[PDB]
């Protein structure tokens, strides 16, 4: 009769739905299932899930498991338009995003979101090539004197005159302490303000998903995100972390930056997005 919100203590019951290589390598999906990062899980049957909506609220939901699930066919719309919607909007969000592994889920999701003026896209997935990065980074533009690099610590996050960073981190991490213990991040600073950041938004074991941004529109295209990422990726290499970059096909600034940093294209997944 409805999709059921799953308690975190039962998340292990959906692990068996993570089966293909693309599913297994998807850091946000696994980070939410592991309980490590912020998200919600909805299932057909809380005792023995056969299909799940895994909402990595900072980035996308995923539909996994059996696309023929009758309850998903009749009540996926109800879950989107009330339970997902209300928690998104109350938390300052505006959008629904879904990412699919399996063509069979497309018609199921399309019937559920049909009246929405949704935008189809694809999410690009990569593999980081450390040797390429180490070769090509010598060509990156050096920072001029007004710009410096700082590792994200509690002082930086709590004293950003804009709560920009704190707000972004809250999409992914239940606390700043959890981010600082389990993740890492670096910023470009100018006039004592955070201009760019590169940080871990999800963790699955030694796999870290990247979030990058240059917040000051007028400072883009100067090499700032590149340098925040370069320091981040060096940290990852030094500490045995595999970084992951996934981005919408239409976000060509991000697609091109990923290629510049030594991320190599591997596969793409269909996405759907609308504004509530
Ligand atoms: C993995 C993820 O985080 S996915 C989400 C990515 N982040 C966002 O979408 C947030 C909004 N966008 C941004 O903040 C910025 O556009 C960013 C972070 C993608 C890039 O920040 P910038 O500070 O402008 O990047 P930076 O100047 O260091 O690098 C430019 C590189 O990025 C790509 N790029 C940047 N702008 C463009 C553009 N108009 N067109 C094409 N490629 C571009 C190019 O590879 C360019 O290479 P170059 O240095 O050889 O010219
Ligand atoms: Cl597979």
Residue numbers in the entry: 0 to 275
From the paper:
Paenibacillus larvae, the causative agent of the devastating honey-bee disease American Foulbrood, produces the cationic polyketide-peptide hybrid paenilamicin that displays antibacterial and antifungal activity. The pam gene cluster harbors a gene encoding the putative acetyl-CoA-dependent N-acetyltransferase PamZ, which belongs to the Gcn5-related N-acetyltransferase (GNAT) superfamily. We show that PamZ acts as self-resistance factor in Paenibacillus larvae by deactivation of paenilamicin. Our data unequivocally demonstrated that PamZ mono-N-acetylates the N-terminal amino group at Aga-6 position of paenilamicin and thereby abolishes its antibacterial activity.
Here, we further determined the crystal structure of PamZ:acetyl-CoA complex at 1.34 Å resolution. PamZ comprises an N-terminal domain (NTD, residues 1–128, secondary structure elements indicated by primes) and a C-terminal domain (CTD, residues 140–275), which both adopt the characteristic GNAT fold. The two tandem-GNAT domains, that may have originated from a gene duplication event, share low sequence identity (<20%) and are connected by an α-helical linker (αbridge, residues 129–139). Furthermore, the well-conserved pyrophosphate-binding loop (P-loop) of the GNAT family (R/Q-X-X-G-X-A/G)26 is only present in the CTD of PamZ (Q-N-K-G-L-A) between strand β4b and helix α3, whereas the NTD is missing this signature motif. Interestingly, a major interface in PamZ is achieved by domain swapping of strand β6 (β6’), which inserts between strands β5’ and β6’ (β5 and β6) of the opposing domain and thus forms an extended, antiparallel, and strongly-twisted β-sheet throughout the enzyme. Although we did not obtain crystals of a ternary PamZ-acetyl-CoA-paenilamicin complex, the position of acetyl-CoA, the well-defined shape of the neighboring pocket and our knowledge about the substrate’s N-terminal acetylation site allows us to predict that the Glm/Aga side chain of paenilamicin very likely penetrates into this pocket. Acidic residues D25 (loop between α1’ and α2’), E122 (β6’), and E208 (β4a) are well-positioned within the pocket to accommodate and stabilize the guanidine group of Aga, as well as to tolerate the Nζ amine of Glm.
